[PDB]
Structures are given as structure tokens and as C-alpha cells.
Amino acid sequence: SLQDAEWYWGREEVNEKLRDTADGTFLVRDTKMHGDYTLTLRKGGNNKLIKIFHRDGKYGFSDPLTFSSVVELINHYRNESLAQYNPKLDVKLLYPVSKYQQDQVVKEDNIEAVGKKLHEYNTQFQEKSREYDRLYEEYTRTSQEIQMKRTAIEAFNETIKIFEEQCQTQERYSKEYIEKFKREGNEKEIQRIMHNYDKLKSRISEIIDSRRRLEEDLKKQAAEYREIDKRMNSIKPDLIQLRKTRDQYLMWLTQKGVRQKKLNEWL
Amino acid sequence: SYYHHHHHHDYDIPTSMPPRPSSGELWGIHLMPPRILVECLLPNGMIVTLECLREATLITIKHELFKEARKYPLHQLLQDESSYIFVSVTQEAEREEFFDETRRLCDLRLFQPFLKVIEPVGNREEKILNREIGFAIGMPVCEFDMVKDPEVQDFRRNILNVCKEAVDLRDLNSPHSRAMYVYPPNVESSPELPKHIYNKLDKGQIIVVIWVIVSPNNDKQKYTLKINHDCVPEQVIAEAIRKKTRSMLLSSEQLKLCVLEYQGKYILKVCGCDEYFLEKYPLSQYKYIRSCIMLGRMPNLMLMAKESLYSQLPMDCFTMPSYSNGETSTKSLWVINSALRIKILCATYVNVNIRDIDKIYVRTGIYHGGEPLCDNVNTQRVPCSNPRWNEWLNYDIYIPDLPRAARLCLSICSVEEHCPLAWGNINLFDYTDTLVSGKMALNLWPVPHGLEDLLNPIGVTGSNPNKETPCLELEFDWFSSVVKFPDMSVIEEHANWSVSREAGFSYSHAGLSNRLARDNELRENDKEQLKAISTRDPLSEITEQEKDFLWSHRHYCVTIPEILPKLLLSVKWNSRDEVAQMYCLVKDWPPIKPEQAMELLDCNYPDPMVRGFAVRCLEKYLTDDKLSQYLIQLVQVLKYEQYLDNLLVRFLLKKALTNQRIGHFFFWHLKSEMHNKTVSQRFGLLLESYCRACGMYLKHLNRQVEAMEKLINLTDILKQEKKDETQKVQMKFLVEQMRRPDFMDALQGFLSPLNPAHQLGNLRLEECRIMSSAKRPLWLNWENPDIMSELLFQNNEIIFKNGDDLRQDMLTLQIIRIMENIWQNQGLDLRMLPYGCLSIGDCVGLIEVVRNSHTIMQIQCKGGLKGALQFNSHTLHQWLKDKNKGEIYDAAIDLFTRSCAGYCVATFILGIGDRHNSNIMVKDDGQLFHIDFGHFLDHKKKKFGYKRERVPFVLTQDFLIVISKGAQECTKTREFERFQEMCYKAYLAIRQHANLFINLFSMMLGSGMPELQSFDDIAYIRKTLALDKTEQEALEYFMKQMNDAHHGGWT
């Protein structure tokens, strides 16, 4: 029992079993010249490690020693909070999540064909992580390409300003040179000034049409940008559960037959 | 039969090198057409489209335009051309006046091909060389001027303090101290010589060579001394002159009197590169020398006239720029009598599949690195659609208990279907110490690759700048007055009180989690447990028992300074009572070694008082050498500062402006990360400071920057439009392009960014080529333009790589380099080759070429016999023998065996990508080194992984044969006993320094390297070093781990 004990396992791999569980989840760990066992309680995405000392029979945190076993001390705190021993620990040992992962995995006692599933799920996972990765590149390329368009538009608008000014700039200096003299040159002079001005505005006209045509592509880009995020967030939740099953399968195997080295062909 | 005739209906056959894109030379296009039409806008209002050569100078274009305008009307309304300057809109959207009329039309970064003519407004032309600055930076300085936020503008004004102080240290004892800035002495940290380096001398003597020039130039003269290793440049300068000016016409007395007049007119250069020996330091301390000893070379220094050196430096001439707490007695934080509550309001832009996702909510939490209270969310309201919660969230911490460095971390999520959409954090106090109150608009960031966690507090403080992303706005409680953080003056009193208070409690009480009987005596068993803790690495997380234990003993902990990191993580940052006291301990805690004090600048120590202490540690101990080694970690660790303006930023900025070797790399690492918006502004602001105050080096940097842009463009064309062309055709394109005059200009006269000691002269094009990789790296070659090219290297070559992302390599090579030092300076000679690497951009960089080295594969191609059948295990050895013959051979194996030993241990400890024939390299001299490291801490273990503790360097026969001269059954020689004994001694040597290696990796979490997303990424290094064990177990662990990859050898 005290070897089984559900939550008893007996540092890094603790934190990976504790990763992404809720406020209250726990388990127990084993230098012996340090202490004996170690309760690892999770509180708000952070791991609280509590020392278990063993001497004349008693197992305890410090003073309140009268609990004759390791399993004596934990059941007591599954019902109750940890604040009475040490102040800022008003959270219980709520979730003793250390099921040996026979809860699902198709209850398969096949050993071999559980390992086939582990390949299957790990191929789906590894496929899925590429799709997630692929899309993250698209996202970040698109974020960039968008802002380059946004900058380009300002540049366009600034270019336009210099040209809108230029068609106006000549009106002043040209229509001084129409009224003074007038007979001198006349249609000869003013035509070839009128030509220059007619170039200038149709150019502006092109430029503005060039900017518009960018902007329409910006919305289409910005639209696709949304569609990427949209589908990133569809893929994200499957990816965690497909991952979570592939931890529990791989755990269920490494309970009975150790076979740590046999795994790598499937995976 | 193969597939069970199962069709994949979806599949359709119709439908390397990835980090794009950018545009280069004109808005649309990478490479402007060789001949081009450009609209010249005149003051008179005429447009005159001018056909111009791509490469034409603006002087040429102006000159021709004022010829060609004559033929248009209104020519009488133009002035002389000399009363005009070109202006146009650049790709950065700013109207840049084009002052330097020597610049070429392709080099302008025009948006559209057009040019406006004007008489130069802004009569301080000089002042509008912030163009220089903004070119170096890659964003225009005017883009800052228009930033609303007053922190930014306060950074800019107040950081100038630092600049002006640095410029003063330069022009203090000039010209010497200026020369000292530009050409700092490149020396080791210790003058002590390791026993293996010494024993390569005649009881401490080296043969040297001092070269000299007399008339006109072009003849040089050797003066081959044999001075003491530990004699100094001045002494060596004398002996060179003595022997130079001995004669049959000069008495001995007469000689000394010619030596004294001559001696101080000279200083020692290194022949072949711009290093110089400018201060009292044992010759052996200068890095050049100590290499020449290790490599079996005779140092080649040059006697150079101080006045020809002081010819070459011009003045830095620092200019203060154009850009040159008022309420009342505001309310103290500790007067506010309420818990924190935070009004969430509405996210706007949440992109979710409503079919897929049920319901979405905002998660929140207060944090300090780790969290001051229960995390809380809000209700699952407005499940998707237009998500809107007008809640107040209520946090069980009294407003006075909020620590100065406190930060709110939030994240919109989806629903045990729990899943983060976006995130963003906010500093609860602003940069002026002011508790944040009112309405806030926070644009969110997307969840990165590895982060499955709901909330992400280690990520950067502040909004996202990308507008079109989930903006979740919110509101903070308003206490009728601007609330501020209490003074130190105030905090010191409240601590002194909490101390006096603590003395008069009952002992009855002192039996609950603090203080106790001990009093001023303590216990010896207690004092034993404390140093035992202290010695543990940072990642051996501490228990609540040990925290309370350490916290009670906080005053004894002053005896053991090095415990501080452990102690600080014991403080309850929510009990301001505790924190105020810790502020007083830290106030005058003993300073500690920089390798230890760097831990205190990671994410887990965000307090100002702590981080100040840490800067004080550095200010005291950390040398210009050791700063320059750890500089990446220090530039990175700026991401974890709360505000723009802070002590660490002021430390580094000053070092950068004081020592131009640091400055050089300090620029490039900042500039490197410029694309990344988590730091775009911070680092830009900072780079503006540096650039404004660094003296002439700006102009030098501006050439390096101009050169890299040319190269980025070139490769970007080669990778997008000259893919699906032959190497043949591509090369025709590369050489053609390189020969254009704008490239010739822009790629020939500059300093290597890999090391600005080396100059890059004319570029030998015949030896320039695109390597065979799909990423299309360029292999570039320059003529070393030194006076003594010949004595060091006649040609200089470095590889430019447009794909890839060097910064993982960058770090592992940096790690290697530190292990080499740790080893060698502790007397044991393992020769690692941390070949140089430098990222300058978004997957862009430079890699040092090592001449005369070959991938094992090449060895075996060049040793493979006749009809392709099987390669020989001996070819390596046979190829190596062919090079090294005689007594030379024996040392070539020793080298192989020494370098192989180190590369075995480093590789195993770092878990770098599996080693195999095409990424392991051996030299003519027989030294081994690894290239192309891939992913470091076993980052292919995200796919399965789990306690794999892999061996990446697996010594095949090939290696073993060479190690044991030539024996069959190699695993059995004493040659190999030694090798193993190297490996074990080295493995243990790194194990004693594992605190550092953790901390170095810890500091790098800041960067967006997928290999380093959070501390358990780093935790692989604990298993592989075996830190939770005794060293004897760790040895056996290593032997075990080593044994099973080779299947026999190790006991």
C-alpha cells in the first residue's frame, strides 16, 4: 500500500506531471542527509515543496509529529487546509492526481497494442505541432507584411502630399507668367506649361489609384491574418489533449514493464 | 497490397531557407533597374522625368537636371543649382533631405523613384546628421520625437547624463586616453599563467619579433628578442631599440642616452590587425601572446610611432541634442486602506471558431516573478461573439502590501478544455513610482510555441504595439489622489520598527515558523544547514521549511553573502513588513562575485533594490574582459527591467562608451534584435544614446551596416527569384552584381563585425562564391589591407548566411568558450575551437571561416579507394598521418585527443544536436571541433523525449583508432586510459561551475529562442551534470552514460 498509495511515486519529472494542473493538485517524492520524503503541492501555477521528516517512528513537517506513517499525514490534509501549520497556505491537498492512468487508454492490458496507440497518437501529435508551427510562421510573416503595407501607405500619402503641393506650387508661379506679357509666347508658352501641369495631375491620379489598390490588399491580408489566429486557436486545445493522452499512455506502460529503451521505435 | 488499396482523396501533388521577407532598394523591388526614370520636382513646379543610371551620384543627377531643366519653361525662376538639395520620401515613410550628394540613387532607400528640389531649410545642416544615427539604428530618429509617452522622452533626456560622463573619461588625458577608448588592450583577466602554458617556455622566456620601418616605406626590419614572458610593452620597446641602435660608433653610455630619447616615442602594434599594447601588463596577459605560446608561434609585433597612431584618431566631439512629481505631497501607498480590485471591461478583437470553442474568459493574477496571492479569473460571460464582462476582480492583498516591482498578468482563455488565446502584463506602478489608477487599454500578444501555461508572467511588461490584435481594456481603483510608493527614508523606519517589535514577542509565540531560542547565539547544526543550502544551484527549488528557516536566519545570512539569491526567494513579497526589512539587509549586504550577482538580474529577481545591488556587484568586480564575455546575457537581461531608465542600462551604456570593443558588440546585439517588437523601442532609444555619444565609431558602424544591407539584399534576390536556376547561373548573377560600383563601394573598405580589429580591404572576387547549401550562404573574401598583411593573414574570409537564426549557435559557442576557460585556467589543456558567430538580424549573421579544416565526410571522400564500395575507418588516421610526420605526429594525436575529450564533455552536457560525419571537423594540425549545433538543450525531445540523457558525440572506430596511434582493439590502450581520464576530470570541472551555466541559460530566457522558453528547458543541464547527486555518483553516472553509447569501455 505505502509503495502503491496512488499519489506516492518515489524533481524535473514531478514539475512535468504538475504542469498545467489547477490550484490544489499534489503528489509525494523521496540526499537522504537532507530529509526523507517531499510533498509537492501546486498553488496557482507554482510548485510548493514541503519537507517530510522521519525519526522515532513519527512522520511530520516539523513540530506536530504524531502521525505514525506517510499515508497518515496526507489523508489528514486532503480534508483540511495547510494554514494551521504554516500561515500563508490556506489551500488544501484537493486533487491527489496520480491515477496510474488506467482511467481511459481503452483499458488495454495488451501491452504491445497500447504501444501501437502511442505511435499513432504521437504521429498525430507531431503532425499537429507542425501545423501549429507552420501557422505561427504565417501569422508572424503576415504581421510583418501588414505593417510594411501600413508604412507604405504613409509613404504613398506623403509622396502624394509632395505632388499635391507641386501641382499647386506651379499655379502660383505659372499664373504670374500668364498675365504678365500674355502676347509673348501666348499659346506657344502656355501650352507647354499646360502640358507639364496636365502630366502632373494625371500622375497624382495614378499615384492615388496605386495607394487604394494597396489598401484593398491590406484588408485582404488583415482578413487572412484573422483566419490564421482563428485556426491557431482551434488547433491549440486538441494539441494539449492529444499531448495529455500521449503522456498517460506512455506513463501506463512505464508502470508495469519498464522498457524505457523499447519506446523509441514507436516514438 | 502495400496500402490496403486505401486512397488518400485529399492529397494532390500540385500543391530549406525560411525567414522572409523584406524589400530592399525601391518600394516594390529588390534591385532597381540598371537604367531608370526619375521624376525631378523643381521649385518652379515643373516635373522633368530624367533617365538615370541606377548607380548615379546625386551630384551627377543634380548637375544633369539643371542642364535638362533649361529646355523646359520657367528656367529664369530657378537659382544656381548650388543653392539646392534633393529631398524625397524613403521606404521608412520619412521625408529625408539628401545632404551627402555623393550618395548613389540605388543607395537612398527611395520609396518611389522621384526627387524634389529645395533650398536647404534647417540652417544647422550639422544637426540633421541624426540621419547617420537613424541609419545605424534602422529607424529614423524623428520617429522617437513624435512618441507621446513621457517615460520615453524622459529616458532620452536623462540618459544623456551617462553619455557626457563617458565622453569626459575619454578626453581626460588625451590623446592617450582617446587611443585607449578606440584600441583597448585585449588581455586575459588573470596575469597568472597556467602550468601547461609556462612549460612551453624556457623558465619564462619567449622569442618575439619586433618589426620596424625607416624609408620611404616598403622595407621592414626584424629584431628578434628573447625577453621574459612577464615583462611589459615598454621594456620590450626598449630592447627592440637597444638592439636596433647598438653600434661600433656608439659607446655604451651613448647608447642608453639614445634609448631614452627614442623609447617613449613608440608603442607596440600587432602585425596584421589593429590590436595594440597600450598599458603595463605582462606580455603574457595580452591575448595575442598567450595564443602564440599555445599555437607554437613567435609573436610579431610592430614598433609604431605614437604620433602616427595619434594621427589616425580624430576627436569624438560630443554634442548635446536639440532635446536639451509636480502634484504636491501626494498620498503614500501605505495610507490606502483597501484590497486591490481591478475592473475588467471588454476585449474587442478575439479570433475564435465558435463551433469549436464553448466559452471564453479573462484570467488574472498579481505577480513578482512568482505570485503574491490566489490567482483569479472572471465568470465565463459572453461565451464568444462580442466578449464583454464588466466585472471587478477582488485580490486578497492589501494595497500597502503590493511590492514596488508588482505586476498584473492577464490572459483571455477558452473552455477541462482550458486554453489561452492572448496575454499581456502591466506594471502596477509606473516609472515615477505611481500606483496605476484609472482606465487602461492593453493590446495583447499571442501565446508563443512552447507556452501551454495559462498566463505567462515571465513575458514582457507592456502592451503589444501591433494595433490589430486583441485589445482587452480595463480600469484600476482610484483613491481621490495619485498614490505613490513610500520613500526609503520611510521604509527604513518601518523596518527598524518591525525589528524592535520582533524582540518583545513571547517565546510561546516564537514557536510558530520564526525566530526561536537561538537569539544571538544560534545553533551549530543550523549554521551547518545554511552553507549547505547556499552551495546548491539556483534550480534546486527551496522548500517552505527552508524558506522560513532562511528568513528567520536572515541576519546570520549576512555572514554568508552568497546565500542572498536563496534568501530573497524566501522573502514573502506580500508581507511589506518582511520586504521593508529585506530592503535594509540588501542596502548594505556584502558585495558578491559577478558570476553570482548575475543571477540577481534574471526574471526571478525583479525588485529595484535587488537589481541595484547586483549592478553594484558588477560595478565593483566585473572587468572589461569579463563584461565582454557575458555581454549577451547582460543585453538580454534588460528585457526583465521594469522601466527604460534604470541602473543596469546606465552601467552598460557607460561601459560601451568607455571601451569601444564592448561598444562594438553592444551595438550589434541591440541592432540584432531590432526587428523584434518586444524590444524595438527600448533598444532603439538605447542605440540612439550609444550612437549619439560613441564618437567616430558611428561612421565605422555605418559602413558595416551599409555592407550588411547590401549582402541581405543580394542573398534575398538569390533566394526568391534565382531559386530554380543553376549554381552556374546564380554565380553569374552574384559576380555581376558585386562588380557594380555601388557594391564595390559598399562592400570594400570596412571593419569586420565578427571582430573589428580585422580590416576588410578590397574584396578578392575570384575567391567569392555561393556555397552549396540551399540557404544560399555567401563565402566572402577580402584582402587584409594591413602594413603586415603577410605576417598574420593575407586574405580574410567570413561567411554571410541569409536564413537560419544564428543565436542558438551564438550561445553554445559562447558556452564552449567559457568551458575552455574554466578548464584551461584551472590547469588542464583541452582545446576547443569556439569559432566566431554573430547574428545581426532576423535570421541573419556571420560565421568565422577556419582555414584548413574539413568535415570528416570530406576526409573519407578523399581517402575512398577505386570503385565505390565501403569507406575505411583508418582513412581519418591515414589522412591525418599524411599531414603530420615525425615528432609532429605525436603532438597531432595529443591535440586530437585533447580536443576530442573536451568536445565530448561539452557536447554531452549541452545535449547539442546529434554529431555525425558532416558536422564534425578536423584540421591539418589534428585538432577536432564541431559545427552546426542545431538545437541545444535536447529540444528534439519535445517530440517524446523523457529522461533520454543523450550522447551526441559517439566516438566511432574512426576516432578511437586515431586516439590510440594505430592499434587494433583501441579501447584497450593506455592512450585511451588517458583520454577517459581527461573526460572525467573535465566533466567534474564543469560540475563545480554549474551555478554559472544555469544562470547563463537563465539570463537567455528573455530572448525568443524556442529552445529556452522556461526554466525546466534549462533543467536538462541538471540531470546531465547530475547535481542532485554526490560527485562520485555523478562520475559513475557519466561513465554509465558514456559506456552505453559505445557499448563497453568505461569503469
Ligand SMILES: Cc1cc2cc([N+](=O)[O-])ccc2[nH]1
Ligand atoms: C562574437 C564575439 C566574439 C568574441 C571573442 C572574444 N574574445 O575571445 O576575445 C570575446 C567576446 C566575443 N564576442
Ligand SMILES: Cc1ccnc(N)c1[N+](=O)[O-]
Ligand atoms: C522553479 C519553478 C518551477 C515551477 N514553478 C515555479 N514557479 C518555479 N519557480 O518558483 O521559478
Ligand SMILES: [Cl-]
Ligand atoms: Cl567554420
